[PDB]
Amino acid sequence: MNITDIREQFPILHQQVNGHDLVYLDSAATSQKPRAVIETLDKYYNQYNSNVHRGVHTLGTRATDGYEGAREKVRKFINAKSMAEIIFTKGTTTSLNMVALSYARANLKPGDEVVITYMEHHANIIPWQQAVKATGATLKYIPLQEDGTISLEDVRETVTSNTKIVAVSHVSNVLGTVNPIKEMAKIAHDNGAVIVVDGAQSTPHMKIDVQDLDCDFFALSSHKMCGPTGVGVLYGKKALLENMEPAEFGGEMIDFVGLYESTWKELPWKFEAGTPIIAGAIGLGAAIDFLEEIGLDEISRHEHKLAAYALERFRQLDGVTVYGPEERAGLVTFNLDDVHPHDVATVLDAEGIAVRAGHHCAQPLMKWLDVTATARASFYLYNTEEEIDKLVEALQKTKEYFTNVFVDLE
Amino acid sequence: MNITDIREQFPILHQQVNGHDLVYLDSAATSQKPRAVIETLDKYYNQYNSNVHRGVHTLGTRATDGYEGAREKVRKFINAKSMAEIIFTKGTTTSLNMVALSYARANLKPGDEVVITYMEHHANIIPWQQAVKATGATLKYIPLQEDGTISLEDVRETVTSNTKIVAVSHVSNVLGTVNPIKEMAKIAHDNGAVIVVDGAQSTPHMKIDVQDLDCDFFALSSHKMCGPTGVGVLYGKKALLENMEPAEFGGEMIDFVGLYESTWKELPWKFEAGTPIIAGAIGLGAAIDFLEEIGLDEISRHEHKLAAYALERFRQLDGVTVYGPEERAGLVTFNLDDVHPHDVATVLDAEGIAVRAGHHCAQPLMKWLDVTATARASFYLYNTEEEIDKLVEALQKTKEYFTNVFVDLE
Ligand SMILES: Cc1ncc(COP(=O)(O)O)c(CN[C@@H](C)C(=O)O)c1O
Numbered sequence: 001m002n003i004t005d006i007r008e009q010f011p012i013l014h015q016q017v018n019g020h021d022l023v024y025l026d027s028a029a030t031s032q033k034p035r036a037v038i039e040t041l042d043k044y045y046n047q048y049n050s051n052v053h054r055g056v057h058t059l060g061t062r063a064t065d066g067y068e069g070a071r072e073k074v075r076k077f078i079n080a081k082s083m084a085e086i087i088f089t090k091g092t093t094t095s096l097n098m099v100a101l102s103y104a105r106a107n108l109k110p111g112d113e114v115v116i117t118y119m120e121h122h123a124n125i126i127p128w129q130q131a132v133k134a135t136g137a138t139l140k141y142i143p144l145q146e147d148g149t150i151s152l153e154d155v156r157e158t159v160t161s162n163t164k165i166v167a168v169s170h171v172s173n174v175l176g177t178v179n180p181i182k183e184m185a186k187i188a189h190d191n192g193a194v195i196v197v198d199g200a201q202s203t204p205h206m207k208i209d210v211q212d213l214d215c216d217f218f219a220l221s222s223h224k225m226c227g228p229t230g231v232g233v234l235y236g237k238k239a240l241l242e243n244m245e246p247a248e249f250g251g252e253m254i255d256f257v258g259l260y261e262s263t264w265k266e267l268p269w270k271f272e273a274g275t276p277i278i279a280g281a282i283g284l285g286a287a288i289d290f291l292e293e294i295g296l297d298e299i300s301r302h303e304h305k306l307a308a309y310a311l312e313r314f315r316q317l318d319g320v321t322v323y324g325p326e327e328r329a330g331l332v333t334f335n336l337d338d339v340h341p342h343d344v345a346t347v348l349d350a351e352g353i354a355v356r357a358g359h360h361c362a363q364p365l366m367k368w369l370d371v372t373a374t375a376r377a378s379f380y381l382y383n384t385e386e387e388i389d390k391l392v393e394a395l396q397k398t399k400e401y402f403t404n405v406f407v408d409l410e
Numbered sequence: 411m412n413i414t415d416i417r418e419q420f421p422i423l424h425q426q427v428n429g430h431d432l433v434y435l436d437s438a439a440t441s442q443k444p445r446a447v448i449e450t451l452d453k454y455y456n457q458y459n460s461n462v463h464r465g466v467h468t469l470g471t472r473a474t475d476g477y478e479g480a481r482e483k484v485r486k487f488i489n490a491k492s493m494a495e496i497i498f499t500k501g502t503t504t505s506l507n508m509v510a511l512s513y514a515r516a517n518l519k520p521g522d523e524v525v526i527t528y529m530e531h532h533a534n535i536i537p538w539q540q541a542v543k544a545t546g547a548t549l550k551y552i553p554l555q556e557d558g559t560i561s562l563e564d565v566r567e568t569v570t571s572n573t574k575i576v577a578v579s580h581v582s583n584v585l586g587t588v589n590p591i592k593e594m595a596k597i598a599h600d601n602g603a604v605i606v607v608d609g610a611q612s613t614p615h616m617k618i619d620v621q622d623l624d625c626d627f628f629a630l631s632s633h634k635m636c637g638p639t640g641v642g643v644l645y646g647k648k649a650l651l652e653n654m655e656p657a658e659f660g661g662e663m664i665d666f667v668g669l670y671e672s673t674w675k676e677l678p679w680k681f682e683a684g685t686p687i688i689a690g691a692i693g694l695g696a697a698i699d700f701l702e703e704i705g706l707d708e709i710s711r712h713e714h715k716l717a718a719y720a721l722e723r724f725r726q727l728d729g730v731t732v733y734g735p736e737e738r739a740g741l742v743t744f745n746l747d748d749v750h751p752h753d754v755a756t757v758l759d760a761e762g763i764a765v766r767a768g769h770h771c772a773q774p775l776m777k778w779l780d781v782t783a784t785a786r787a788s789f790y791l792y793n794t795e796e797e798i799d800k801l802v803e804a805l806q807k808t809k810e811y812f813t814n815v816f817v818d819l820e
């Protein structure tokens with residue numbers, strides 16, 4: 001896996017920021033796109049852009065072929081059984097909301113439990129809050145161990161026979177934890193519940209097998225896996241998606257429309273109201289082709305390489321706290337002793353290094369960590385060990401600078 | 411307004427389809443993009459792609475600036491008062507659904523009336539069906555006159571003091587009708603109702619002034635107005651959007667998140683859950699700049715030119731029925747005597763002409779017209795009179811062909 005060859009595919013990497021070479025370490029917020037994706041979009045808008053499922057003309061046929069072929073590529077990419085289980089959405093947040101919607105609106109009664117975790121992204125928290133509010137059900141949290149992992153026994157004790165939904169992250173955008181999705185799915189099925197995997201931060205970096213995970217729902221975002229913004233995927237088990245009512249209504253999802261009553265389409269289009277994200281989905285299919293040609297397991301090996309390297313180099317800096325397990329997906333959330341994370345991020349950007357600072361849409365986890373904010377650096381398949389070297393050098397320089405400014409206090 | 415210069419901006423137009431020069435007459439399903447939009451997307455993914463409202467680094471700042479500047483361009487483009495009234499959505503269908511959602515979930519009681527029309531696109535029908543179902547309210551239809559327009563007196567008689575929502579198209583995707591949105595908004599306000607304008611088919615072709623229309627909600631789709639797929643806009647009066655609850659929940663729309671309770675953000679982000687359609691919105695802003703530089707009133711003049719020309723040339727063909735008024739937005743929905751519309755569309759595509767055939771997501775209107783399906787040709791700012799000449803020549807040739815095949819029946 002030659003990473004110079006891969007980096008040469010991403011034009012955005014080859015620029016300077018504030019006089020320094022760009023060091024992008026914020027892929028967990030959004031990823032960059034290779035020439036293959038951008039040129040897929042260009043070819044779409046230059047040659048065969050048309051609405052799909054409507055006009056029965058040549059450009060319409062090409063666009064329909066592209067969109068549904070993207071659907072098939074997504075099906076292959078996560079080993080779903082049928083394209084009917086692959087629903088194009090706006091992103092992971094929308095997919096989780098769609099499950100929260102048809103569950104709440106039809107399968108939640110008082111006494112039923114929805115169990116989540118303290119590490120969940122807000123997208124995997126608030127929909128369940130609102131659903132249990134609307135239905136009178138109960139919201140429960142799975143506690144975390146002190147290394148930021150989840151114990152299977154805490155799961156088994158928290159999920160009871162009254163649980164209808166277990167909702168859990170595949171990979172934590174803050175701690176780097178990889179959760180035991182398979183065992184948790186088995187435990188949820190033992191208790192008669194479905195399992196909803198937020199796979200937003202796993203899909204870009206590791207192989208997904210929904211058959212092996214036996215997840216009932218899986219949500220992913222294209223903009224993290226080298227794909228266009230504005231598109232993502234909901235996977236649901238076909239049997240479940242048949243019995244869920246649509247979250248949106250309009251064209252492309254109806255069969256018969258009367259003045260007062262309508263019938264829906266078969267899957268997947270039942271859950272795709274309106275003109276779909278045609279270009280975005282075709283570009284996501286291109287992104288999938290790109291990753292599969294690089295190899296997902298090679299990407300996993302590269303990310304474990306970078307994460308072990310980053311962890312080892314962070315322990316070489318005094319006065320830095322890293323949060324989460326040693327076994328991780330390759331992201332480092334941390335803080336500097338007596339330096340605010342926002343300030344860290346600002347000084348890193350003055351060195352051309354891009355990190356995130358704040359709560360990372362995980363306020364309960366921040367409170368659990370007993371911090372108000374944090375800094376995070378996130379790695380992907382275009383990131384190098386030299387970049388982590390640059391990061392840790394800039395962290396040392398930052399701490400030296402704020403010590404040589406603390407001292408200058410008269 | 412030089413239209414050769416404009417056509418030279420659209421690379422997709424300069425190709426052949428099935429041996430013939432492409433004649434795209436299906437802009438009402440989706441429009442084509444000028445170099446300015448595609449190159450805006452390219453510049454985004456090549457130079458400053460990053461998530462916006464999160465990382466506080468330079469590329470993040472550029473992307474945030476682009477996204478919110480697109481919001482301001484949309485605000486100017488439709489003369490909204492505040493960016494807080496401009497919400498980025500997936501498209502017109504989603505915006506209408508969002509109004510249907512927060513109205514149903516909080517402002518509809520039994521006895522309340524939601525009034526629509528027989529000409530409404532399915533996107534502006536089914537959400538109201540489902541909302542009155544969930545709330546026990548009543549759904550009413552405004553009848554149409556025999557030329558496919560709406561009489562103001564039928565509106566006044568159909569909307570009563572128990573009406574909370576009047577939902578109506580600005581321009582009909584089938585009949586070409588331009589509805590009296592302003593007078594209808596006044597009548598709805600007189601009865602204490604809000605008015606929801608489906609402006610999906612008006613925004614690309616004519617100037618929008620939400621202040622002059624006094625609409626309470628306005629929905630539009632980017633892919634019709636030379637902009638990217640997968641993005642659209644909901645406009646709501648700020649006072650109304652403050653009191654509506656969000657349709658989606660997750661990051662970017664919260665302020666404080668507790669274990670069980672959360673508070674929302676201020677407008678507009680209250681209604682934008684998750685990573686937004688960054689590239690799509692920036693490209694939509696580019697599309698708006700493009701149209702404003704061409705001039706919306708020049709586009710209206712051009713479309714009235716093409717529609718009058720098309721109507722006059724259609725009356726020159728015997729055995730063709732055109733549906734709708736003489737005063738129109740420039741689209742022609744029609745049928746050939748003893749030729750099925752799908753067949754018409756197929757033969758036109760063999761001549762390289764792109765039209766739509768079917769019900770155009772307006773089944774109640776099709777039944778009202780007493781037809782099961784129809785053919786439609788739709789014009790935009792890159793379409794010429796020569797193309798309508800080609801269309802009517804191919805229609806004459808089609809009818810000659812099916813007469814010289816009816817005769818060959820032994
Ligand atoms: C008046 C109107 N409203 C709403 C829509 C659909 O909204 P979306 O942008 O989300 O698709 C359309 C699209 N028509 C298309 C479907 C057509 O002409 O066949 C429309 O013409």
Ligand SMILES: Cc1ncc(COP(=O)(O)O)c(CN[C@@H](C)C(=O)O)c1O
Binds near residue numbers: 028090221686
């Ligand atoms: C685990 C997880 N779930 C869900 C989301 C948001 O889904 P969208 O693709 O619709 O944004 C994110 C994005 N995180 C971003 C916000 C971050 O790292 O700050 C995420 O990391």
